[model samples]
Target: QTQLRNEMIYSVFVRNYSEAGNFAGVTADLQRIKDLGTDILWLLPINPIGEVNRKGTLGSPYAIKDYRGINPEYGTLADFKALTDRAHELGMKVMLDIVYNHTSPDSVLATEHPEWFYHDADGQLTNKVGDWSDVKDLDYGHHELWQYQIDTLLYWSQFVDGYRCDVAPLVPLDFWLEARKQVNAKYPETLWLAESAGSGFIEELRSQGYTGLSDSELYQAFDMTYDYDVFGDFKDYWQGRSTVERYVDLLQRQDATFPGNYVKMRFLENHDNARMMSLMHSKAEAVNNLTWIFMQRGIPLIYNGQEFLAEHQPSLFDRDTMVADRHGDVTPLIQKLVTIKQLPLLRAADYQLAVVEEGIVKITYRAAGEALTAWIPLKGQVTAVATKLAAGSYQNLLTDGPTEVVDGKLTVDGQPVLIKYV
Candidate 1:
């Protein structure tokens, strides 16, 4: 509660996050995530996955059968509430994923409320478009259906602190604006997160004659968005598809493009991507540097098992298992990073970013007061880095030792080097 509006979120695919794949297992792990410096916990849909046209052994959780009910395979309603309560007890805010863009082929909406569905020229119920044979899209133009979805969100808002909307832009923004206003009327602190679809996905919907908005536009109705565009650019730099400076340039663009408080959910992996520890190769130094970099930025996000450096991306559509273990004492480092981010220097926008050199992936974060500067040498060994902090003395957050900033040169390990505010 002492931190900024920016958050450190942890994403969990409930069916695969633990061996038990239930609320009890998640509740048991809340403290572990909190200890890892996680503040917000974004859980995949808890509603029952549809069986008809299902993909995997258990089916996709996003393909919901009912919005108000919990998947019996996971736990009972009481059990879910207990999980949320326990997470809150650990100082972690819980957010649920809401899938209102579409429902499963056999969803109750189809049979019970037939008018709630999209219809073709033949008057037959239809999907919005494409080979998405698994689910049927809802008719947002249907005023009664919009009311039903909004009412459902208000109903569930009683238990959940907020929601992470799935494929949010596809659903009408007016609907979200109304829903948020109505829900916040009851719970003022409730946050609305949007998983903004990518450019290709947006294009696909637009080509189908639908009005699809981008993340920036969607922000008017929601709080956060997945940083896929910036993340993709980072990936390109990682794979040598581009240079690191290009990625930094993108970050600078973000600073100018949106509001000073606009937040992007920062992460390297989730259920949809490859595991970060595996993708990072053998560079533990770079891994730690990237983790802290996220902390230093807008808002940090950690996928489940990232602290343990899990090499596998757990199955999203089925019950895949994960090992319950720790790795390399990342706990202490994360806690330290979280503590630093809560401070004014890191949390505020009074910091400036500069490059150490043109070609190299080196950067520095300097606070306005000339008290602190983080020399981030992203890659291999480096001899020196430029900084503006005073040439006197400062302390490192990681190792509680004093280092003399003699002659404006701070000798560093080229890791996540942070010079504390004197």
Candidate 2:
């Protein structure tokens, strides 16, 4: 469990990762990714996309056409195998994205076994929810669909270390539990990650008499769940409907609500949203926000291109290339944060957060009577803010600076500072 808690996940979208936009391109760059302290390399759907009612010229990867087939646009099956094989050689595990919730309208399953799909009152095939025109939802009532999807998972477990189950809660828990049980028989040590939905959506499904699992419920089968629970509040804070203190409060609440060993994949941005830089007030704010993410008691998930401090989000519906040198590289800071996340004290410690000001926060972690605390002024420079640490001068572990506490309040101007609390 500690191993799972200490791991770092790096998500990749092969189409936009490089100019080549192929599996070999990923295979070619395993060294750099490995050097980034990545433990698990999670790739977006590698399966072929459905052409009928496709969203864009290339189509959405989630609208999978064939479970067993590799996306030819991504290269041959052997090319994908090489990517996985190289990731293993570099001591990093590969996680392939699996979309079991739905499939493209013209998917192989839809063509061969239309009975496995959902139908409307008119007895015509229809999507279970959402305005997603490119894909249709699966009907889990048919037992055969369960066996087939589990078998598909079995095939991928041969090449990859785990499955990043897309919209996992949409599928039945029994099926996920059964899939885990069977997949473990063939390939043990396979990690499971759920791209969980927000609470509102889960409740919406519940209102419809359909079974929907919350993040806490999904933990019964998955090793990790996406940070979607608090992500909405994070967005709200940026958009002026909330505050970082409220966001931190929600994060702190997770400590008491979930299982002790539960892992939430902490991230600032991903393929679904604009770049973190684009949403942040400034680059300095991003630094403080990212610092909080790494320092939090969860695994860090680095979406590709984040190290470059990019503002331009690559498109999902079209061929848009990401700028390689957007705002120069913040790789050094990222590597430093990863190291902090791996510390024995940090991993084993109990975390606590408090708001000292709008732009600053006091975070503390303690284990075995030793404590680690820091004051981060995220939004802007500040003259003084409250803190729990004793009055003294201390060195900043995140970067080169001095952290001062005068009369039980932080006296230093806006900058992140860390100390070995005594």
Candidate 3:
């Protein structure tokens, strides 16, 4: 299996990435993005947004009108090709977002194959969720729809490296597995990312007579899946409805429950989620969460402007330009975290998580007989022995400073610490 555990993904909402907000705009920033230690550039939907039944001044990009058509609002097909080429030149892979679960009610596929749509009792094509009224669901049961979707992906694979499938769980697992098989035949290094629905949403859809696949099922085809499986619990902890330990437990449980090679897309914020800055009371809190995400056993995602500590969530429907000023640039910190992620122990299968204190968590990842231990202080000061390491002076992977492990004990100073032992 292709390991994405060491890669860092940087997400770009093209509309908000720059003043031009087009493929050319992204092309210009390739060097800076790559310099941020990004391995893959995950772009939001680039297909033409449906005009009919559109939401807001500009329709949601998720309501794609044509699977193969480039959004003229962004640029021409040639322009996107140039952007991808430039990213490749910068040694970064580009992954376009694919919305296969549904399309705009006025999409070409909708008009051409009305039978390949989910219709209500009144015979009106409808979205699985009422809030997504701008789009209509596609019926995957229709074998022909599967072919069309797969063909579109294959076409995009020529220019892009891979795809981040939108609401992938709503689509049948069999279709995804088959699509992977076919797409890989042409693009062998193609990466597959799934925006798997949250746990509660999955249950709700299942109750509504919809087939909602789990992260485990989606992993059979996808190289990475959204952390939505436990994101709800993550939010609950923030909402004061649950304890942080509960959320931490869920994170640990995933490794044991999922396939040995599974890779969950670890993220603090995304296009659909609120900004991490908005959720935290202080920069320290936000930074701690960011540190926790990096220490995890999967690829970490940085929503555009996250490194700059942008507080506002860019609107999905408006032309919200992201501020590029270096007010709170944590680029140095993020660069260090990304470097730590590349360590061999971070990607190893042997992993453990323990809550040592109220706001501190200890995580250990091992390969063969060697181990890498991470101590994260999310709130207050935490001190614990480096049980996995021998009594000696070792380098702190996060700080690059000497940390003394005396008598098999290491103390942390409220900052994140990672120590490697062989």
Candidate 4:
């Protein structure tokens, strides 16, 4: 309770959500999302994408052509309003992707204010990242440009609950710090989640002498930062290039890197990342990590169809739909994780991680009055992990079955075990 609010953000890509692939389709599924205990529905950019130099059958949503206009492929402005309206009715907040770093080459702002666009070293209107030829970056130095962005952000805060800023660290930190102050003046409770660049990416940018804010600096204005700091370690471990202990060590580093109240959004898979399901060695391994990230600090995320263990990542530039039956449904497990994520003791707890086995980690959340211990066997092992929990039968929070510790150690297998101590 001493930190930022605990939220479960569910990402939605309209093109892949349903047969309609529009705002209405998502509107129709609000209750289902609500049932999963989602606190925020973060839709990929709802604005139009540029047809010029488009990527595939459809352009990338990140290549916004218009900041204010709704993408006709999705629906009218009224439809989006109704979507957020419906979301509010169901008690879930809505966040729209704010791709402020760059836009389609022929974006509305680029055409109107050509002076505001950034030119690369080669004197071309392009992004710093060489691979993305479909979009161009914006120059943030002009003060009026700041005003324009602030005004545009305020216009959306009228309806949407938050802005999931795309590559926010690539933009100027001062802009966001002031923008949050300005946005807060009116929409006092509007959430701001920064899609912060990873540590290595920041180093790369810095090595190139480019201005890129670190996660710690971005935290000045945003409520949450993407867990990109330690994400590479996870990828390394999964790809067989590193040990799981490195991943846990990075997790422990986060506790010291930021303030105790600071939150890093915990997610297994996202639109840009590889599908986490395909990396799992077993169903239990998938479920254990699924349950594990929730028990860690901060808000958790459910990329659409992630609950069903869908391994097919929907394409950003095509009409690919996420498969619901690719794997067994983990919806019940997700619901259980959501319940534990919002637990008051969890909010009040001080979290720590100890790698008790090769791929199994012991998670301890100790608080003033109560504590929760979790043994996550990500590599599917049978081992007894030292625990801070007492030796007695208690309801395993995950399964609601009787589980206990014996002589200060708990035997665990592929399945994750979570139990509370009063």
Best by lDDT: 3
Instruction: List candidate 3 segments past 4 Å from native.
Output: 238-240, 324-326, 382-392
Global CA lDDT of candidate 4, please? 0.84
| Residue lDDT tens for model 1, 187-303 | 888877788876787998899898687888888877777786577876787677887667778877766776666777777777778877766754556345554456445677777
lDDT of each: 0.73, 0.82, 0.85, 0.84
- Report the Cα RMSD per candidate: 2.6, 2.0, 1.8, 1.8
lDDT of 4 by residue, 290-317 (tens): 8767878888888998777778878899
Comparison by lDDT, 2 against 4, better one: 4
Q: Report lDDT (Cα) of residue 402, candidate 2.
A: 74
Judged by lDDT relative to the true structure, which candidate is superior, 1 or 3?
Answer: 3
Q: Give the winner by TM-score: 1 or 3.
A: 3
lDDT of 3 at 260: 83
Clash pairs detected, candidate 1:
none
TM per candidate: 0.92, 0.94, 0.95, 0.95
Ranked by TM-score from best down, the candidates are 4, 3, 2, 1
lDDT by residue (tens digit), candidate 3, 1-422: 42688889999999879888888988887899999999999999998999889998788999999999989978999999999999999999999998988999889998999999988899999887879978999999999898989999889998989899998889999999989999999899999899988778899999988989988888889889888878787778767788768978888787787888888888888889888877775666766788888888888899998888888888899788886523487888899888888887777878888877555788898788888888888764666644646677889988899998887678877787788877
What value does the lDDT take at residue 171 in candidate 1? 89
